[PDB]
Amino acid sequence: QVQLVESGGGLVQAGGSLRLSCAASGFPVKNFEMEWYRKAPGKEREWVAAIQSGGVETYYADSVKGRFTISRDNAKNTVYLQMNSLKPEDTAVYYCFVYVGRSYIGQGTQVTVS
Amino acid sequence: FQPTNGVGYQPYRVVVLSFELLHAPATVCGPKKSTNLVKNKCVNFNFNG
Amino acid sequence: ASVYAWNRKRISNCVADYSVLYNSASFSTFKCYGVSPTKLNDLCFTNVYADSFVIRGDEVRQIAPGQTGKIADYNYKLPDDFTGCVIAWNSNNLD
Amino acid sequence: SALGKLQDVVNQNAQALNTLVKQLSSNFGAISSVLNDILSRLDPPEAEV
């Protein structure tokens, strides 16, 4: 019933920009909290972002506060996040994450900064 | 696509039975099996509905 | 502790005044189930089994009987006839 | 067993009173069978049901 479909990744260099997507099925995004996670190669899975269920307040981890912009699209049922000022530390597989009854994991998309 | 091509060069015929999750009614599935019946025995039965 | 190996710390053979813990304003939630917190100073128990764990901000709703969620259904389940208090406060300045 | 039709009246009223009193060791769908453990740490708009 619930599936998260990641896209929008790619290969950029240092100082690049990108626009990811997380296509979602089975739930409106107005009712639950969504999150973004990433997993670098050789590193464990780390949290990236969140938008709350009211749609007002967003958060980020300490490496990614202020540089990225996460947004929701309500009619599309897809949650994006904007990449700007891409350091090579952001080389990871990016997973969008949601708690709708059971918490569910997408297969992710690849962003390489080099 | 020549007849003296190899199995890597000759076409593997691909069909994609796509699956998505959108607000649409279910139309095409796979089949449903059904076992044999015995008679003169207290058994639970499940007919079509 | 984290909640896959959440710590049960049972307390025994002492006197606890829950009016001080009731009147502390550093806590946010005071949801309780058995018999009144204004008479928690008035009764007399046999065993405590106090807990200590750290969760998200959204799993405050999960600390109730028969909830949904992978903590509630898979990791840390409360009984349907759960009897006791939960006390909680935000720890953004600690964790 | 000569006086059974006098005995069964007293035995039935004793079994009725025994059945009447034994109803008060039952939970009746609440959490407890004693009043305060049902009511009072629970919120009084939702314990009166």
Next chain:
Amino acid sequence: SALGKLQDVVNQNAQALNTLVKQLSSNFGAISSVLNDILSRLDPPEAEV
């Protein structure tokens, strides 16, 4: 019609039994009259109600 004084007893007993059969299909103000729909769609400790 001479034998109505025996027929009314059997008719009243079948009437009483066939009344009590018809409250098997009574919702009584719940969500569902079938307990399978009770267990299937809605959550266990509020299926208590």
